[PDB]
Design a protein around this ligand. Structure first.
Ligand SMILES: [Cl-]
Lengths: 278, 275
């Protein structure tokens, strides 16, 4: 059995190649839109959401060809959300991962439309997947529920509404559950659906994915202090937030404790969510 | 087309009620996003694209209940595209239909997100529809292809890229075929799929829908004056092109019985409307 480290490298290379083939060429008109779409999603990175799709499918022995559309779709939703988030009317960021944000590299109109078109391509890839129609529909329902006003978009809105206000712990947790937790749970659910998981196992994996999405954000908050006025270290104290993260780490491992080596990839994504330095 | 007008009023009332039931409550969190989503699609309008879905299904005797998801989805895509198109970085409009645009009634960030969420809701409604999964997938494929970079979004980008430039007649026609032609064809296609249409009928209806989308744009350009088709062809040349499209649309549907009257009336509307 291949180690988690080897699997993550293989899946990161795989999703890079799949996304490159799935996006329109920069030489086809409209060239600026296509260039901006590619600029916004190609070029590496953690690929946490594709990795969750593959790692979840891996629990069931599912081949990557059955997972590629689901894995691309969650990265495309994630990528589009960041293109819009970076806009001057939103978070107003000029740099992302050491490179100019998409609206700086191009312009705001191009960034708006590139985000719009990446969202459509996420759904199109699922609808076009070489899978049974019932499975494509189940994946599409999952992604839509997690990405819209009941998930990612709603969480973005809760965040914008809270600009300049101090959120309570309850409200901060709820905001993160929508803004990033929902799409992280969708990634795990879709991988397991492609693995033909049944509902009890879907619910168990959802409990793991729920904890992982929060863990990632608590860790991020801790790192920000070590390197949206309300954060887990500000509301809990730094020691309290570290204890919160430590419990989520233990919780994630306990949920998967009965699996064999087939869960090592998911286990390692949990460790990365808790322990990464960047 | 008076009997058709009654049908269209029924369908405009129906799609208003359907969209109202499908959108989140303005009392529930996040309230401002939900309110902006509702502002951006409720409150009447022509409902051309839902009417095309219902009328295309009507050709096959399909009842509206089997068409609501598809009809809502094309209006939601259309609605989101206008919210983003009105933004200052795009067309920069303060009014639409005599009322403030969404980013004026709310703010730019809320409008961006409302557009994003309406797009998602369009896909979720089709995916959740009470229809065979194979039919839901075919409609979802149709909508995604027509709405993204190879359709509506691509046409919007072409339009912005040509700002201040003189376009050839071919380029302008290509731009409109993506910018609004694709989603109009999608509406007719989805109605026909829900009607269990056979491949020749789908191709026939797609020829009709292609002509209808162009005619609708040519008529909106003519009304706007009262690079565009009037600018390239003259006001008289634009009107001649409209009449040729009208005759093509009626020719394509000519062999059908009264079940095509709804589509025929939408063709007449696209050409003759004062609004
Ligand atoms: Cl292996």
């Amino acid at each position: 059995h291949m180690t988690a480290e080897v699997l993550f490298a293989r899946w990161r290379d795989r999703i890079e190649s799949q996304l490159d083939a799935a996006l329109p060429s920069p030489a086809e008109a409209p060239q600026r839109l296509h260039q901006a779409m590619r600029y916004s999603v190609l070029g590496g990175g953690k690929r946490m959401r594709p990795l969750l799709v593959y790692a979840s499918g891996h629990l069931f022995g599912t081949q990557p060809e059955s997972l590629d559309a689901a894995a691309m779709s969650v990265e495309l939703i994630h990528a589009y959300s960041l293109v819009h988030d970076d806009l001057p009317a939103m978070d107003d960021d000029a740099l992302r991962r050491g490179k100019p944000t998409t609206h700086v590299a191009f312009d705001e109109a191009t960034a708006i439309l590139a985000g719009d078109a990446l969202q459509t391509r996420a759904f199109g890839l699922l609808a076009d997947a070489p899978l049974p129609a019932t499975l494509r529909v189940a994946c599409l329902q999952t992604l839509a529920h997690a990405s819209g006003a009941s998930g990612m978009c709603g969480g973005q809105a809760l965040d914008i509404d809270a600009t300049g206000q101090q959120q309570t712990l309850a409200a901060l947790t709820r905001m993160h559950a929508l803004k990033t937790g929902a799409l992280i749970r969708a990634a795990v659910r879709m991988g397991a659906l492609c693995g033909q998981a049944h509902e009890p196992q879907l619910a168990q994996l959802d409990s793991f994915a729920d904890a992982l999405g929060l863990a990632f954000q608590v860790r991020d908050d801790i790192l920000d202090v070590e390197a949206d006025k309300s954060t887990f270290p500000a509301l809990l104290g730094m020691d309290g937030a570290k204890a919160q993260l430590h419990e989520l780490a233990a919780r994630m491992q306990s949920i998967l404790a009965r699996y064999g080596e087939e869960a090592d990839a998911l286990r390692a994504l949990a460790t990365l969510a808790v322990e990464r330095d960047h």
